[PDB]
């Protein structure tokens, strides 16, 4: 069986959400491949299927949905509600075979024709990340929408919107202490707002940051990476600035020795 991490938006405080994200990170990496104080997610190639996925159980009103997160990139691939399961379109064959292992005891399995990346989901949702709100409200409503998709109520522009909400508040909060902290400040003051460009460019730059950090000359980037702040305005040439920012990376190369 796969590991399960529990969370509910009913009474969610900065403490409970924080401990939830930290448990998610704990199950994403063993901690055995840390480079520059940043853990590297395990390599996809040699990974047995029995270690490929993580399960996140969300609850609220008390409807529960189980998201499936890919261990190799902390990203959501599908979800389970009741006796139904819905998956994102795989981009090769081995991940599809791995998907068949996720929710084996459900009656109905349906794979969306579209992938899980931000582009396609944005196009389905009618909005893009820059205008969709994040917060405990958006998450609590997202859980209900996901549950009632299998019931037959929710439509696609709402389903995919709830998808990008869950992905940002869970997957990207796990990837970055920065985004986790911003969600903590939204939960603390009951706020609900669109993620400012700092968040969005960090989301778009996760893979490139992984590559540059693992490929650096003892921390020094070979090429500078461009990021943004909150107003939208910089280059990073080193891993030092990113240590309290990024919490998880993809396996790009082998450790140098």
């Amino acid at each position, epitope marked *: 069986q796969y590991p399960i991490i529990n969370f509910t938006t009913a009474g969610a405080t900065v403490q409970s959400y924080t401990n939830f994200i930290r448990a998610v*990170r*704990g199950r994403l990496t063993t901690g055995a491949d*840390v480079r520059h*104080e940043i853990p590297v997610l395990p390599n996809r190639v040699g990974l047995p299927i029995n270690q490929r996925f993580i399960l996140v159980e969300l609850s609220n009103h008390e409807l529960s949905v189980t998201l499936a997160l890919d261990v190799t990139n902390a990203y959501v691939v599908g979800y389970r509600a009741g006796n139904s399961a819905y998956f994102f379109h795989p981009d090769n064959q081995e991940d599809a075979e791995a998907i068949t292992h996720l929710f084996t005891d459900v009656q109905n399995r349906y794979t969306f024709a579209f992938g899980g990346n931000y582009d396609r989901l944005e196009q389905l949702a009618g909005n893009l990340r820059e205008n969709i709100e994040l917060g405990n409200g958006p998450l609590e409503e997202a859980i209900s929408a996901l549950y009632y998709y299998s019931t037959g109520g929710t439509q696609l522009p709402t389903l995919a919107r709830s998808f990008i909400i869950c992905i940002q508040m869970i997957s990207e909060a796990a990837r970055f202490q920065y985004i986790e902290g911003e969600m903590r400040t939204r939960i603390r003051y009951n706020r609900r707002s669109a993620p400012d460009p700092s968040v969005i460019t960090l989301e778009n730059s996760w893979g490139r940051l992984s590559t540059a950090i693992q490929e650096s000359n003892q921390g020094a980037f070979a090429s500078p990476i461009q990021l943004q702040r909150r107003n939208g305005s910089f280059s990073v040439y080193d891993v030092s600035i990113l*240590i309290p920012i990024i*919490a998880l990376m993809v396996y790009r190369c082998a*450790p140098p020795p």
Partner: nanobody
Amino acid sequence: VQLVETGGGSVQAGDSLTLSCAASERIFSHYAMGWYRQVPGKEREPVAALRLTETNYADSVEGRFTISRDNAKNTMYLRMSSLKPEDTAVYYCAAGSYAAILYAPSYWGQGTQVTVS
């Protein structure tokens, strides 16, 4: 991949001890490190932490404990001054990520007994 400790023992209240932790080369350049402690029957609590450089001390030990590092010898140190009976525990050297050194570390040493009576 290895964390070796030494420096425990039995002292009286008000005395001091200094723990040392020889670390592997890979751990030393890519990991945050720290010191935890545990009494039989209770949970492991973090005591000190060296990150980024950045220090993090538990409220119980701030002002009395000082964590330090020697880059040229692959050894981390914890100086424990003005010891109290509350400090009696098994102390563990630890190494983890930047975020998860203050909670849920990655690597551990054997654990050295510190007795304050």
